[PDB]
Symmetry: none
Subunit: 127 residues, 2 copies
């Protein structure tokens, strides 16, 4: 954990400073409340098992930010290919992520930092 | 609370200045009495959970006035989007808020200061 990494003189990851796996679980749950109540986005998840998705997305986000847990889901490009997702849709999703993070009390400088890991992903996500 | 924040040498916020979460609860309560009695605004709130709206609006105001807790609701543009709210409507709402702050005993200078935090939010709301 964070304690073990500190004794190895490893720098503190984004994962660690926001609160590890438990913090990410709570953010992702609020994230999807937001995304599904947005009628610009809801129709994308019409045939989606949401419990399974939040499972994979907690895994993906935790790995992207420095966590030790493996991502067990499918490649980003493969999943989002041909779903008609534009940059408008990506930006709206990204916006709900920032909103979720803000609501969990994450400092805004750290949120900007997370958006910087996330923004490049649009290349695989969008059409 | 305010006592904790003064021992951390945080300057006094509008939130703590006007009386904290409890004082804003009382203001927002009287605020929507004024809004729902105004014929120019009443119809927007037909079929809305007022209890739930109150909770979110207290949370918003508290955070806009420099309080300790994050706003956890929806952004101002998204929530008010597609509702046809005009500057005339926003101004009536801000006037009702000013009048509730007055009734609560908040000094004129601090209401003016609160309206300076609020007024810019019209870009999003309208
Ligand atoms: C912001 C960057 C994004 C990340 C990090 C992300 C992450 C993920 C992950 C981990 C999965 C699960 C893959 C699997 O099942 O193996 C997934 C699936 C999915 N994504 Fe995203 N995603 C992003 C953006 C978007 C956007 C912008 C949309 C459209 C608005 C979208 C729509 C979907 C849908 C509908 C599924 C599930 C399909 C299904 O199985 O029903 N994603 N995403
Ligand atoms: C003074 C600036 C204003 C602030 C700070 C404000 C704040 C808020 C907040 C926090 C919410 C709830 C967001 C959520 O559910 O997550 C909301 C919703 C709403 N507001 Fe405002 N608002 C303002 C001005 C106005 C104006 C001018 C109108 C119309 C005349 C209006 C009418 C509404 C309506 C109809 C809702 C939706 C309630 C529902 O969920 O059905 N607000 N507002
Ligand atoms: C993926 N949402
Ligand atoms: C909300 N008013
Ligand atoms: Na509409």
């Amino acid at each position: 954990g964070l304690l073990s990494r500190l004794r190895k003189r490893e720098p503190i990851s984004i994962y660690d400073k926001i609160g590890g796996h438990e913090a990410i679980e709570v953010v992702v749950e609020d994230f999807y409340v937001r995304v599904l109540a947005d009628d610009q986005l809801s129709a994308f998840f019409s045939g989606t098992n949401m419990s399974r998705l939040k499972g994979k997305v907690v895994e993906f986000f935790a790995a992207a930010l420095g966590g030790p847990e493996p991502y067990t889901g499918a490649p980003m490009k493969q999943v989002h290919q041909g779903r008609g997702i534009t940059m408008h849709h990506f930006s709206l999703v990204a916006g709900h992520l920032a909103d979720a993070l803000t609501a969990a009390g994450v400092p805004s400088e750290t949120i900007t930092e997370i958006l910087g890991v996330i923004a490049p992903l649009a290349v695989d996500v969008t059409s």
